[PDB]
Amino acid sequence: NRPILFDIVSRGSTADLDGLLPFLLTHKKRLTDEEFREPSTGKTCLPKALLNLSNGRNDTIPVLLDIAERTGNMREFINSPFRDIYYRGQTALHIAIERRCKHYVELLVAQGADVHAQARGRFFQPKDEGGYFYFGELPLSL
Amino acid sequence: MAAIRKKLVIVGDGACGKTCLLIVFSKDQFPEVYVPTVFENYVADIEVDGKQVELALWDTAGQEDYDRLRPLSYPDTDVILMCFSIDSPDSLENIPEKWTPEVKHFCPNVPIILVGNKKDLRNDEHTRRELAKMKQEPVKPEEGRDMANRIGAFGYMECSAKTKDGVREVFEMATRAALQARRGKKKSGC
Amino acid sequence: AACTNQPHIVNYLTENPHKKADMRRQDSRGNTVLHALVAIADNTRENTKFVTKMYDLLLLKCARLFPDSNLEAVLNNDGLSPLMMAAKTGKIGIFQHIIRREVTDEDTRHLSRKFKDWAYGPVYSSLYDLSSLDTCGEEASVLEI
Ligand SMILES: Nc1nc2c(ncn2[C@@H]2O[C@H](COP(=O)(O)OP(=O)(O)OP(O)(O)=S)[C@@H](O)[C@H]2O)c(=O)[nH]1
């Protein structure tokens, strides 16, 4: 259900998410399963939701967070780091800070998002080294 | 003052209790019903000698489809826990043949700490009786003492997740190994 | 009419119930409306603004009326296109605008030449198009000219 869920979250529709929790409960499938995660970079539902949104109000974040809470895997899900080389270590908090939305930052911090996570991807490295942007590899520094 | 973040990765053969070891470190409560295949994305606070360290604990598995993604967890590792079982002798001879060269291939010049699990199980009678069916005996601690020397392990220890014996000291040794700055560079090019 | 900055006349003449002047029409020289507009184009501050405005308006109208064919594709007898002719004649004012042409309209955004790739903080990465700007011997290139 990775493609359908990705499309639903990208479109921002909230009704389509109905029935996901019963499916997870019946199949006992966690939201961090390899199948759900994008193979290319280990990207998960939450960073995809935060990347694309309308006026900073994607409106799908709280529902997904509640679902993760019900599954009992909120801590792992919120701060799931990206794999690969270019965007290694990036988390949801960095994206929320970058998009200049205070509300999602407050939500992630309150729900238990890690605040000392380090982003060490090559894209985040200094200019002369190969990374187009460098900010100290920290949320507060960013 | 400011806690220092260090990366610890635990690697061992299946059913060795690596996940149980890290879980007992995490919540000091043995899960007797449900054990996740991997315990990921956890940072624990530890103080050893006037220093505060946040240890990021990573686990590696190969039960299903985890071998392909295992290499991704090695880079930027600060300390390795080479983990095996005292109740399963087969967990020993496989350490040098296949695990060690991979460790040196991906992340060289990294401190490695040997650890054997299930200290009590070595003295059990049912385990000994079942194991004798194949002409095998529990792992001898002295054999581990020497095996640590052969593979150049920083230190080798024993842990028992059931009775929470030596977990604190073992991971403290891991951390003290991590804080070590290593020795410059060897045979560095001109 | 286009070269004399008379948008109303061009609009009326393009769409009239009696007769219509197709924009993809070539004279003896082969130059079409865009070719002539580039020919009279000048590097002066005032001339460039109206030249670019008329060029964009006419190109959008031609694309809207005929979606299959692109107006810039037509070539003159010399074989050059409006971009190539502007490059050869040394008219930077229209050339730079043509290179970085971007259309916000969804219906006819395909004919744009500059796209946006992604933005990360102060860093902005944009994806230009060089279909005809660089050619590996298939056809004349703007760079060589
Ligand atoms: N006698 C004894 N048995 C233990 C002890 N600790 C753990 N065991 C068993 O070890 C197991 C360790 O879990 P786990 O490491 O995930 O097994 P695994 O199948 O090898 O996991 P994997 O590497 O294939 S992904 C626990 O499930 C528990 O049943 C102990 O202290 N004493």
The domain locations on chain B are 4-179
Could you tell me which of C51, C58, C50 has the C-alpha nearest to residue C11? C58
Cα C39 from Cα C145, distance rounded (Å): 17
C123-128 and C114-120: which strand pairing? Answer: antiparallel
Burial string for B118-133 (b: 16+ CB within 10 Å, else e) reads: bbebbeeeebeeebee
- Alpha-carbon gap, residue B70 to B85, rounded angstroms: 20
> How far is the CA of B157 from the CAs of A19, A119, B8, B129, in angstroms?
49, 34, 16, 26
Show which of residues 94-123 on chain A sit within 8 Å of chain B, judged by CB atoms: 114, 116, 118, 120
Going by alpha carbons, the residue nearest to atom 23 of ligand 1 is B14
- Long-range CB pairs of A64-68 (<8 Å, 24+ gap) are A64/A9, A64/A17, A64/A31, A65/A107, A65/A111, A67/A17, A67/A20, A67/A21, A67/A24, A67/A31, A68/A31
| Ligand 1 contact via B21 beta carbon (within 6 Å) | no
Nearest Cα residue to atom 22 of ligand 1 = B14
Q: CB of B63 closer than 6 A to ligand 1?
A: yes
Q: In terms of residues, how long is chain C?
A: 145
Q: Do chains C and B touch (3 or more CB pairs under 8 A)?
A: no
Q: Which tokens hold the place of B27?
A: 């919540």
- Tokens for B5, please give them: 């973040």
Q: What is the greatest pairwise CA distance in chain A?
A: 51
Q: Which of residues 38-97 of A touch C (CB under 8 A)?
A: none
Report the gap between the CA of B53 and the closest CA in chain A (Å).
13
Name the CATH superfamily, with its identifier, for domain B4-179: P-loop containing nucleotide triphosphate hydrolases (3.40.50.300)
If you measure from the C-alpha of residue B16 to the centroid of ligand 1, how many angstroms do you get, rounded to a whole number?
5
B135: left (phi over 0), alpha (psi -120 to 50) or beta: left
Answer whether B121 contacts ligand 1 (Cβ < 6 A): yes
Q: What DSSP character marks residue B165?
A: B
Distance separating alpha carbons of residues C108 and A110, to the nearest angstrom: 45
Q: Is the dihedral of CA B119, B124, B127, B133 positive or negative?
A: positive
Chain breaks in chain C (C to N over 2.5 A) after: none
Report the C-alpha dihedral over residues C10, C15, C16, C17, rounded to 10 degrees: 180
**CB pair distance less than 8 Å for B72 and A83:** yes
Residue A23 in contact with partner chain C when CB distance is under 8 A: no
Residue A85 near residue A121 (C-beta atoms within 8 A): yes
Q: Which of C116, C117, C123 to mutate to test the interface with A (most CBs of A within 10 A)?
A: C123
Q: Which H or E run contains B100?
A: helix B100-106
Q: Is B65's Cβ below 8 Å from some Cβ in A?
A: yes
Contact C121 A123 (CB under 8 A): no
CB B84 within 8 A of CB B13: yes
**CB of B48 less than 8 A from some CB of A:** no
A99/chain C closest Cα distance in angstroms: 8
B20 CB within 6 A, ligand 1: yes
User: Which residue's CA is the closest to the ligand 1 atom numbered 9?
Assistant: B17
Quick check: A93 and A139 in contact, CB under 8 A? yes
CB-CB contact of B4 with B52 (8 Å): yes
Contacts of A138 in chain B (CB under 8 A): none
C8 is in an annotated binding site: yes
Tokens of B72: 């991704």
Give the nearest ligand 1 atom to B162 CA: 31
Structure tokens given for C137: 């011997």
Contact across the interface for A98 and C122, Cβ inside 8 Å: no
Resolution of the structure in the document, Å = 3.5
Residue B2 DSSP class = -
What atom in ligand 1 is closest to the CA of residue B127?
1
Question: From the CB coordinates, do chains C and A have 3 or more pairs under 8 Å?
Answer: yes
Interface of B with A in 112-141 (CB under 8 A): none
Closest residue CA from atom 12 of ligand 1: B17
Beta bridge partners of B9: B58, B80
Give yes or no for residue B111 CB within 6 A of ligand 1: no
Residue C120 touches partner A, C-beta closer than 8 Å:
yes
Tokens of C33: 């409306």
Helix axes A61-71, A102-111, angle to 10 degrees: 10
